[PDB]
């Protein structure tokens, strides 16, 4: 059982919408320290890891911890009309139901039946970029290919792609307001699938500060924060 309240329904819905792009349903583990969710996409190419600590909620009480199955698509629809300033309440008693309340101009509560749902990497590069850069870079690349190569060096982050004819190169340095930070341990190179990145960055926000870590022909870790303490992390297998 538990009653959890997050202030900013719209923002919570977007977090959930970002996750629904890769996965359809997931198990949310509610403990006293926060909510966490972890799942792999159908094709086993992308892992999504979400962590929302209690400090991000205006109210957080968990009498007895528990895991609940959730269909992201169904949750998505329910949260669709939550507004930017609406209050969101997630409450569960002993029964197998989830009570979702969206409180703003009125108090709207949904009762939805719950359904059960059943290795540190040595990244040699890290960059922090404005979500707009990834969103634009992925669409640019899609115009010429289904593959995009990530290249990182000191003060230089490069994403490039090339198809049967045209090619595109998106480059950033610290002078660019698109690159917020760069820490490279050595020239790092790896390639990834444009479609997967497209789904990963779709829900991404234009001004969100995204962190990216990867290694040579190694998967890429992509994360961005929620109310500073929250975190949504993507782990994407490479196109070696």
């Amino acid at each position: 059982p538990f009653e959890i309240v997050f202030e900013g329904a719209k923002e919570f819905a977007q977090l959930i919408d970002t996750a629904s792009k890769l996965i359809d349903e997931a198990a949310f583990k509610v403990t006293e320290d926060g909510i966490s969710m972890r799942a792999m996409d159908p094709s086993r190419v992308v892992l999504i890891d979400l962590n929302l600590p209690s400090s991000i909620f205006s109210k957080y009480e968990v009498v007895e911890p528990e895991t609940i199955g959730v269909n992201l698509d169904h949750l998505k629809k329910i949260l669709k009309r939550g507004k930017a300033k609406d209050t969101l309440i997630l409450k569960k008693g002993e029964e197998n139901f989830l009570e979702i309340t969206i409180q703003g101009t009125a108090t709207r509560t949904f009762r939805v039946p719950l359904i059960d749902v059943e290795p540190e990497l040595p990244f040699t590069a890290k960059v922090v970029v404005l979500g707009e850069v990834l969103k634009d870079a992925v669409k640019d690349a899609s115009l010429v290919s289904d593959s995009i190569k990530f290249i990182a060096r000191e003060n230089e982050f490069i994403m490039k792609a090339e198809g049967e004819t045209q090619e595109v190169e998106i480059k950033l340095t610290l002078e660019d307001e698109g690159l917020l930070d760069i820490e490279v341990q050595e020239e790092t190179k790896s390639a990834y699938g444009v479609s997967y990145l497209s789904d990963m960055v779709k829900g991404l926000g234009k001004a969100d500060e995204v962190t990216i870590k990867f290694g040579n022909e190694m998967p890429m870790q992509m994360e961005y924060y929620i109310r500073d303490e929250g975190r949504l992390t993507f782990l994407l297998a490479p196109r070696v």
Binding site: S43, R44, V45, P219, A237, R239
Partner: peptide, 8 residues
């Protein structure tokens, strides 16, 4: 080829 997370 597109590798799987299972490869790492």
């Amino acid at each position: 080829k597109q590798a799987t997370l299972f490869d790492f």
